[PDB]
Design a protein around this ligand. Structure first.
Ligand SMILES: Nc1ncnc2c1ncn2[C@@H]1O[C@H](COP(=O)(O)OP(=O)(O)NP(=O)(O)O)[C@@H](O)[C@H]1O
Length: 382
């Protein structure tokens, strides 16, 4: 009666949905043709509600009515010190309502609306739901959904509630690092094994030490940095090009938030290309004052601008090993997770840290969590 159940990675920055079909996990592309979807919502002045790529890609000078980063607020109270810190950096309004940080926005024509963070995530979940239904050709009603291993009782319940709002029965909440391990068939291993999961995404860096003992996972320790991710690498590159643009002209880009957002979208794309190529062209017609932008970024310059942030990832790996009473030698499996682990330098740094030990390979790191959830959803489907 559960039909075809879906596996959903609900990411801070990008979400992914898979399903088990004809004996194999399929990761599903959304209606813009992408296998990941921005965890973003926007509201046009005409009152259209946009979700995903359409919402992130919308140029506007009104960043107040775009909503993202709801995973930082979900399941948490208004007065939670972490909420109070995060709202300093968010461009949308957050207000105390019913003990919680509600998001307040203009929904169209000056009509204000407030949304609990789970109602925001419910919109993202609706989008993932729609993505799977278009693929399957039928309605979907049940889901496996992942959360970071450190999520507490309230954050897990609020993720289920988001499902409920979206019409999804969330049958199982699984930990993200565990789903990635499952994607790589690591639960099948025989005896006891120590697994380090290094997960570097868009907004966050999570390191997890897991133990597997005949198909039973244990989260032994977690560490990382909740404000370190792919978005931070983008910002270093933006700073670089804004600085260069000023010097080469005399103009300061930053007065035009449409211009900044244009450069952001393009810098993001180039960074992705530099995981595959050694140079990438950034170009924006009518960039600033109707003047056109064209520059090139090398992989080497990308690495140089970010090297300190890249190296900073090793400290939490050290701490995790310490708190687990383990040394590097005690690690039997290394699992790379998150879109930022596609960056060659990040893969090089992790390998060197583990004295040349190769990590698991073969599943896209930004899809491995969804893949593991789909693996479980396949058993639950029938
Ligand atoms: N090929 C690539 N090369 C470099 N970066 C990439 C590549 N592909 C995706 N990314 C980045 O991966 C980041 C998103 O990672 P992803 O794991 O998909 O997000 P998430 O699941 O929301 N993780 P999180 O933001 O930490 O909650 C974004 O900053 C992307 O720009």
């Amino acid at each position: 009666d559960v039909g075809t159940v879906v596996g959903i990675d609900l990411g801070t920055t990008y979400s992914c949905v898979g399903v088990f079909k004809n004996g194999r996990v399929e990761i599903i592309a959304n209606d813009q043709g992408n296998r990941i979807t921005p965890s973003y919502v926007a509201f046009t002045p005409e009152g259209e509600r946009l979700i995903g790529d359409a919402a992130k890609n919308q140029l506007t000078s009104n960043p107040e009515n775009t909503v993202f980063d709801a995973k930082r607020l979900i399941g948490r109270t208004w007065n939670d010190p972490s909420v109070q810190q995060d709202i300093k950096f968010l461009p949308f309004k957050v207000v105390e309502k019913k003990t919680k940080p509600y998001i307040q926005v203009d929904i169209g024509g000056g009509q204000t609306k407030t949304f609990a963070p789970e109602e925001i995530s419910a919109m993202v979940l609706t989008k993932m739901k729609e993505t799977a239904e278009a693929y399957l050709g039928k309605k979907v009603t049940h889901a496996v959904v992942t959360v970071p291993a450190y999520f507490n009782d309230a954050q897990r319940q609020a993720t289920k509630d988001a499902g409920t709002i979206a019409g999804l029965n969330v049958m199982r909440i699984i930990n993200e690092p565990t789903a990635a391990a499952i994607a790589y068939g690591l639960d099948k291993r025989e005896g006891e094994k120590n697994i380090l999961v290094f997960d570097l995404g868009g907004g966050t860096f999570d390191v997890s030490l897991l133990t597997i003992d005949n198909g039973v996972f244990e989260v032994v320790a977690t560490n990382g940095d909740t404000h370190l991710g792919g978005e931070d690498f983008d910002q270093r590159v933006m700073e670089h090009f804004i600085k260069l643009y000023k010097k080469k002209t005399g103009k300061d880009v930053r007065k035009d938030n449409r211009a900044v957002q244009k450069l952001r979208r393009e810098v993001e794309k180039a960074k992705r290309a530099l995981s595959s190529q050694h140079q990438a062209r950034i170009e924006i017609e009518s960039f600033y004052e109707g003047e056109d932008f064209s520059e090139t970024l090398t992989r080497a310059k990308f690495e140089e601008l970010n090297m300190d942030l890249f190296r900073s990832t090793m400290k939490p790996v050290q701490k995790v090993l310490e708190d687990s009473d383990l040394k590097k030698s005690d690690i039997d499996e290394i699992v790379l997770v998150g879109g930022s682990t596609r960056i060659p330098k990040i893969q090089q740094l992790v390998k060197e840290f583990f004295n040349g030990k190769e990590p698991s390979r073969g599943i896209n790191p930004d899809e491995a969590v969804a893949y593991g959830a789909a693996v479980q959803a396949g058993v639950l489907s029938g």
